[model samples]
Target: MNIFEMLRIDEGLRLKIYKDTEGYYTIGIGHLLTKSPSLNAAKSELDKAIGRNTNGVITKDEAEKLFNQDVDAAVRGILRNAKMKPVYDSMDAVRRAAMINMVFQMGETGVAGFTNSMRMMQQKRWDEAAVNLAKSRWYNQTPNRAKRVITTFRTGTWDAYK
Candidate 1:
């Protein structure tokens, strides 16, 4: 297996920033807040995986790249699941990306909870899909992010969020 896969198996994948068992701010393939020899030694891997500063905090670029693998895995997970694949394959890239982002945030199981939304999307009913998305508890919990995703489904463009 490749190094990324090895690290993923070893460290576990985390799409969001969370405290490790040791209470350090850690994210993506076990990039940790505490200083380690491997971290400082492998400058390129360190930089590409997470842009660590002198304070050992991860930067935005680093965070984005760190999440990329996890996000891809989430997308692949959706594709691999028999129930989610049809709807996923039918979507345009913008909608697909939006759905992938949701999977990244909520996980495949959480995203799959949107049964009605997926059904609407499968039918190519953009408005209905948007409405279904808006009606969810997920939308209630995070309206601002939900709005962009809902708009993307409705409009088929990325500009609504950007």
Candidate 2:
């Protein structure tokens, strides 16, 4: 499964601003635009993503651009981490997608906090990695998404497609 495509569906595309499942003001492929931080500071980033002057509904192209930016940032975030670099680099594409997707949903630090899971993944201990993934607040909040990713880790396969 292509991570970007999977994430596009997972996050869902929104041209207009809306609250995420967590009630944060977000737009255009789960871009956390105007919430969480000081609202003004967050909205400032929205302006930069598509210019304040370019108001109203964003085009799909624009949303896709933001999506690429987010996915790219997540990918870079994972590789940029100190310990994750070696382990992430050693992963197969399926496992890599699992890691990147988690980092995308949360932050690099958030996923990196899964030290045991990371260790199991690095060791190619698929069962242990999947088990560890289920034992997290992330799974508690987003069990379905977490399950899909955990399945990927378990099987070392892309089991879904559009």
Candidate 3:
């Protein structure tokens, strides 16, 4: 699904694809592109970010090069897992890409920090999971971001693995 379908991103924002680096491509969130070379490069970076993080979109060769073995392995590891695969495969576009970014920033093991919270979430305990989630190391590092993922978890719209 598209960003609009999931998050209801404004038309202006939705027009641009959700790229890596938290930037929008067509509308230019971080860096504006003036030429094919620059656009291509930007797209490439975005592609790599997405590839390194998730698989809802295709990444360019140039983009893939930016990812180190650790990053590639992190995403690949998730893809290789049966539990993670289904969730990752079913996300809305924006959530999928955003999650990939989160996963890249925090590897599978890193994200596993949410074990207690994830269990609470699995039990449909939103309040408890929310509290537990905030207690995590990632909470202070990226609360807003964690909220997005947690929102998905809470709503059952996306899995903890996704």
Candidate 4:
């Protein structure tokens, strides 16, 4: 599966600012500026990510370019996590896409916080993984998106919503 396609569909594209479901100031393909550890740092990076002074707007080409960089950043973060790397290796392609999608939104640490549930995932206990994931504040925070990812984890398929 194309992670880019899947994520673009999941995130939707925006060339300008908007509040995400959680109320952070986000742009492009959910590139969050205000949510980062240093607001100015993220803002500075976004300017570089778009390759021109944003001045509050960007082209679709810039947005697409930003999206690719975002995915690679997420993948790089995921690969560096010892716990998640093996868990990632254990899943099928479709299932891994869901994991990547989840990590893209949550960051490596936030995803790692689901310690027990992730252990179930690493153990390949699909049903248990879905059940445990559903019992999270993350589930309620992005209810519909979380449901689909959990279901994807359980089924090892993105067919339902793809």
lDDT of 3: 0.48
State the lDDT of candidate 4 residue by residue for 29-115, as single tens digits. Answer: 978777655546556766876666776678898888778888998888889999888888887888888889988998888899888
Worst 10-residue stretch by lDDT in candidate 4?
36-45
lDDT-sorted candidate list, best first: 4, 2, 1, 3
Q: Is candidate 2 or candidate 4 better by lDDT?
A: 4
lDDT by residue (tens digit), candidate 1, 1-162? 222332344356554555665455566556553433344433434444554332344555555566566756877898898889999899887788777667766678988799888999999999988988998887897677678778878888766544
Show how many residue pairs clash in every candidate, following the order shown: 0, 0, 0, 0
* RMSD to true structure for each model, in Å: 9.7, 2.0, 10.2, 2.3
Error of 2 at 13 (Å): 0.7
TM per prediction: 0.65, 0.90, 0.42, 0.90
Per-residue lDDT of model 3, residues 3-47, tens digit only: 222322211122233443334243222122222345556556545
Q: How does residue 157 of candidate 4 score in lDDT?
A: 69
lDDT of 1 at 74: 78
Task: List, residue by residue over 20-98, the lDDT tens digit for candidate 2.
Answer: 7777778888888765745555556667878754454578898888889889999898778888888899888877887
Tell me, by lDDT, which candidate is best: 4
Q: How far is candidate 1 from the true structure (C-alpha RMSD, Å)?
A: 9.7
